[PDB]
Amino acid sequence: KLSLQDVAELIRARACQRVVVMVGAGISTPSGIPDFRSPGSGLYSNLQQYDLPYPEAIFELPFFFHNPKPFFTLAKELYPGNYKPNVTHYFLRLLHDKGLLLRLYTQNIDGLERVSGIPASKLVEAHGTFASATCTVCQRPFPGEDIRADVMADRVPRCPVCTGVVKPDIVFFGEPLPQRFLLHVVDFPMADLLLILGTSLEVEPFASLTEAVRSSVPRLLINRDLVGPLAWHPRSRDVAQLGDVVHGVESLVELLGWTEEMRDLVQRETGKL
Ligand SMILES: [Zn+2]
């Protein structure tokens, strides 16, 4: 058995230079990111004014092409700017800056990884991103920055060449995952540490990735509770810090002796923001 502290030591001793992180919704709740599926919110209330059989319909093509305006409501809401990364995000920013981060697989679409300062090439956004868009009609690619004004103005972005709808590269139901997902073939075998923050590991094939790391490689789950493959097939080098994600992360930063540096990075970074 290893403890959180033992993992911290591997990092401190420089024995973990190729960390692979998987993270889910649990890291973005702190930043106040609303759940579109959860009642009681401002965003949930918004979508309720449209004719939708359930909230998940905004992620279905047939609905989109019937009426795109529901989706673009969620888009406006989640578009970069509205929200600020949290300590969880900057922690991953730190790992990058110490040359310790091999890759960061995320299932969020809120973009808070890009904002906290992590480079597209270190990221694999498994659910897609608002940081770019495709024309539905002619297949043309565009910077998210470009449909920005239309999305904040409640207008349906339209392609300049053919004037079709320009859609953020989010993944809808039935859609194949982004191309970058296939980086897992080379990232997981090569990982010396696997870190899993704030995800309940139900959605496949995301969950099954935790089974791609070598048995000699520790797997650390920081999360509300023990979940999926980590729960059903345990491994001897598995460590769980069960509890509040933010709390658990501050503990690791502590055990790593990164307190000072984290406190700082968080003040440059949200300063600017
Ligand atoms: Zn077009």
Q: Helices then strands (H, E): number in the chain?
A: 11, 9
Alpha-carbon torsion 233, 236, 238, 239, what sign?
A: positive
- Nearest CA to 67 out of 83, 53, 51 is that of 51
Binding residues for Zn(2+): 135, 138, 159, 162
CA 180 to ligand 1 centroid distance, Å: 24
Contacts of 233 (CB under 8 A, 6+ apart): 211
Looking at residue 126, what DSSP letter applies?
Answer: T
Please list the helix, strand and coil fractions of the chain in percent, rounded to the nearest 5, in that order.
40, 15, 40
Alpha-carbon dihedral angle through residues 204, 194, 180, 31, given to the nearest 10 degrees: 80
Resolution (angstroms) equals 2.7
| 127 included as an active-site residue | yes
Instruction: Kindly give the pairing relationship between strand 193-197 and strand 19-23.
Output: parallel
Contact indicator for 30, 88 with CB cutoff of 8 Å:
yes
CATH 3.30.1600.10 maps onto the chain at 30-85+127-178
Looking at residue 177, what DSSP letter applies?
Answer: P
State CA 123 to chain mean position distance.
9
CA 134 to ligand 1 centroid distance, Å: 8
Spatial strand order of the sheet with 141-143 comes to 141-143, 128-135, 166-170
Environment class of 249 (CB within 10 Å of its CB; exposed 0-12, middle 13-18, buried 19+): buried
CA 28 to ligand 1 centroid distance, Å: 33
Residue 238 pairs in a beta bridge with: 219
- Collect residues with CB below 5 Å from ion ligand 1: 135, 137-138, 140, 159, 161-162, 164
State CA 132 to chain mean position distance.
16
Element (DSSP H or E) covering residue 156: none
CA 75 to ligand 1 centroid distance, Å: 20
CATH 3.40.50.1220 maps onto the chain at 1-29+86-126+179-273
CA 50 to ligand 1 centroid distance, Å: 27
Give CA–CA dist 19/101, Å, rounded. 5
CA 69 to ligand 1 centroid distance, Å: 19
Give CA–CA dist 151/19, Å, rounded. 36
CA 70 to ligand 1 centroid distance, Å: 21
Contact indicator for 241, 251 with CB cutoff of 8 Å:
yes
Other Cβ atoms within 10 Å of 140 Cβ, number: 15
Binding residues: 24-44, 107-110, 135, 138, 159, 162, 198-200, 223-225
Q: How far is CA 51 from CA 59, 69, 70, 251, 257, in A?
A: 14, 11, 9, 46, 52
Give CA–CA dist 149/179, Å, rounded. 28
Element (DSSP H or E) covering residue 64: helix 61-66
Environment class of 206 (CB within 10 Å of its CB; exposed 0-12, middle 13-18, buried 19+): buried
Contact indicator for 250, 87 with CB cutoff of 8 Å:
yes
Instruction: Kindly give the pairing relationship between strand 101-106 and strand 219-223.
Output: unpaired
Contact indicator for 117, 91 with CB cutoff of 8 Å:
no
Residue in the structure block whose two tokens are 């009609």:
137
Residue in the structure block whose two tokens are 């949930």:
44
CATH superfamily entry for domain 30-85+127-178: SIR2/SIRT2 'Small Domain' (3.30.1600.10)
Binding residues for NAD(+): 24-44, 107-110, 198-200, 223-225
Instruction: Kindly give the pairing relationship between strand 166-170 and strand 128-135.
Output: antiparallel
- Residue 174 in tokens: 């039935």
Other Cβ atoms within 10 Å of 65 Cβ, number: 11
Give CA–CA dist 105/22, Å, rounded. 5
| 1-29+86-126+179-273: CATH class | alpha beta
| Residues of the chain with a following break (C to N over 2.5 Å) | none
Other Cβ atoms within 10 Å of 210 Cβ, number: 23
Contact indicator for 126, 206 with CB cutoff of 8 Å:
yes
- Residue 165 in tokens: 């709808």
Looking at 127, 184, 233, 247, which residue is catalytic? 127
Helix axes 259-272, 245-256, angle to 10 degrees: 130
